[PDB]
Amino acid sequence: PVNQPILAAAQSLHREATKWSSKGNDIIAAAKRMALLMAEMSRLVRGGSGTKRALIQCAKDIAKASDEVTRLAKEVAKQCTDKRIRTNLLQVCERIPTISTQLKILSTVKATMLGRTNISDEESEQATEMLVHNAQNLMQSVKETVREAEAASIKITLRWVRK
């Protein structure tokens, strides 16, 4: 069914995001959608063909959800009194648009490769491993962004309720 390391990265973010309720928290909601979509991604990279259009669109959905995470976490940071946390939170959540832009590039590469041209099992495996590493980086960054966004809120209209 799956590419295990992508699914594991997805579950890793799911575990952090499900510490809290989505109610009145769109960072939490977006992060949960990201983890669910990234699990779908691991199915798609490990299915196919037929999965070409789906691979591209799934990455687009993930990138859209990550813009919401980024946008909100930047607002949290810029209300945070602790410079140490504020700076760290700005540092991480400003990696995210680049990583999720990279997710869209590498998914399209994996999906479409060289168009009509024939491709080896080596190029195919290499393209998988590029995608894998980028997915782990993304899941890591958002998980760190969730943790720090909550840490920063202690120093401050966003709701953190433990489940």
Numbering used by the authors: 961 to 1116, 1123 to 1129
Original paper wording:
At one level this relies on proper links of the actin network to cadherin receptor-mediated cell-cell adherens junctions, to integrin receptor-directed focal adhesions, and to intercalated discs that are required for muscle cell function and that orchestrate coordinated movement. These links are provided in part by vinculin, a highly conserved and structurally dynamic protein that stabilizes adhesions complexes and which binds to actin through the agency of its five-helix bundle tail (Vt) domain. Metavinculin is always co-expressed with vinculin in muscle but, unlike vinculin, it cannot homodimerize and rather forms heterodimers with vinculin, an interaction thought important for metavinculin functions. Importantly, although its insert does not bind to actin, metavinculin differs markedly from vinculin in its control of the actin network, where the metavinculin tail (MVt) domain (a surrogate for activated metavinculin) induces a fine meshwork of actin filaments while Vt provokes the formation of tight actin bundles.
To define the molecular underpinnings of metavinculin's unique functions we solved the crystal structures of full-length human metavinculin (124 kDa) and its tail domain to 3.4 Å and 2.2 Å resolution, respectively. Rather, an α-helix of the metavinculin insert (coined H1′) and its amino-terminal extended coil replace the H1 α-helix and its amino-terminal extended coil that are present in Vt, which are no longer part of the MVt domain but are rather disordered in the metavinculin structure. Indeed, the H1′ for H1 replacement in metavinculin results in a new five-helix bundle (that is comprised of α-helices H1′ and H2–H5; residues 959–1,130) that closely mimics the five-helix bundle found in Vt (comprised of α-helices H1–H5; residues 891–1,062), where it can be superimposed with an r.m.s.d. of 0.69 Å (for 153 equivalent Cα positions). Thus, the true helical bundle MVt domain (residues 959–1,134) lacks the H1 α-helix of vinculin. However, a comparison of the tail domain structures of metavinculin with that of vinculin demonstrated that α-helix H1′ has several additional interactions with the four-helix bundle H2–H5 compared to α-helix H1.
